[PDB]
């Protein structure tokens, strides 16, 4: 299990983060998103509610994991360790490649 | 245009005596701008209060903001709590 | 630097006098912003090729 340091403060997110889609490597807590502490450049449309909990038995591939996999492939173009940790680190390289194919 | 500014600050004096209601770090977090209060998250996209059709000076004091926010009716919620057990 | 705080979770039915942990504090009221949502951008803006 990873830890997700909330951006714009130092807090730890409990079980729900809010991923940003234009800086693409930030997160937020719920309370910093309810009040709008994420800077006047962003617009509260580009924040997807992602979870942090360990999901169910493998080879289910919820839409959160598919989205983060495709975010990783748009990020790195290679480097399947850096894809598999960005999925969440509870999936192997040899399964992320078997799911993208 | 930078991204990685700090935009939160902490004062050194521990004033943590009457502060259990604010947002604590775990001290008190002090941001660089205020908060934003949003009444209702979901817009109600039809409703000629908002859609403004082109057919046919009048005022109307509607009850609350809850008209504009897609609330479910209670008979469905009782039906679903009956389906609970 | 001119800082700000979070929203106090004091209810609307509290009626107590306003206590202050510091007398160098000040208090302000936040007017909620409310109108037809400004036209959000399309999904081509949110998630283009980088």
């Amino acid at each position: 299990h990873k830890v997700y340091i909330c951006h714009t403060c130092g807090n730890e997110s409990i079980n729900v983060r809010y991923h940003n889609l234009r800086a693409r490597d930030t997160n937020l807590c719920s309370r910093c998103f309810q009040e709008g502490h994420f800077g006047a450049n962003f617009q509260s449309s580009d924040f997807i509610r992602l979870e942090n909990n360990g999901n169910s038995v493998k080879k289910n591939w919820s839409d959160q994991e598919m989205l983060l996999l495709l975010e990783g492939i748009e990020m790195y173009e290679d480097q399947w360790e850096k894809i598999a940790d960005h999925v969440g680190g509870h999936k192997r390289v040899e399964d992320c490649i078997e799911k993208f194919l | 245009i930078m991204i990685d500014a700090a935009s939160s600050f902490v004062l050194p004096i521990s004033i943590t005596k009457n502060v259990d209601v604010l947002q604590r770090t775990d001290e008190i977090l002090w941001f660089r701008g205020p908060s934003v209060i949003v009444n209702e998250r979901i817009i109600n996209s039809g409703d000629p209060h908002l859609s403004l059709p082109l057919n046919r000076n009048e005022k109307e004091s509607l009850p609350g903001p809850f008209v504009l926010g897609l609330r479910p009716s209670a008979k469905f919620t009782a039906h679903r709590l009956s389906m609970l057990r | 630097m001119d800082l700000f705080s979070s929203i106090i979770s004091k209810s609307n039915l509290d009626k107590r006098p306003h206590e202050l942990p510091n007398t160098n504090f000040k208090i302000n009221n936040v007017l909620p912003q409310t109108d037809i949502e400004n036209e959000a951008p399309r999904l081509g803006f949110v998630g283009a090729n980088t």
Binding site: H1, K2, V3, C9, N27 | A6 | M1, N24
Partner: peptide
């Protein structure tokens, strides 16, 4: 009180993204 410069909390972007939570993989004595 007006001479009380505040402490910035820096986020350090690589810490915000994916930090996990070595002898506990027993291959190194």
């Amino acid at each position: 009180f007006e001479t009380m410069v505040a402490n910035p909390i820096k986020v350090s972007r690589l810490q915000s993204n994916g930090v996990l939570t070595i002898h506990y993989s027993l291959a190194n004595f």
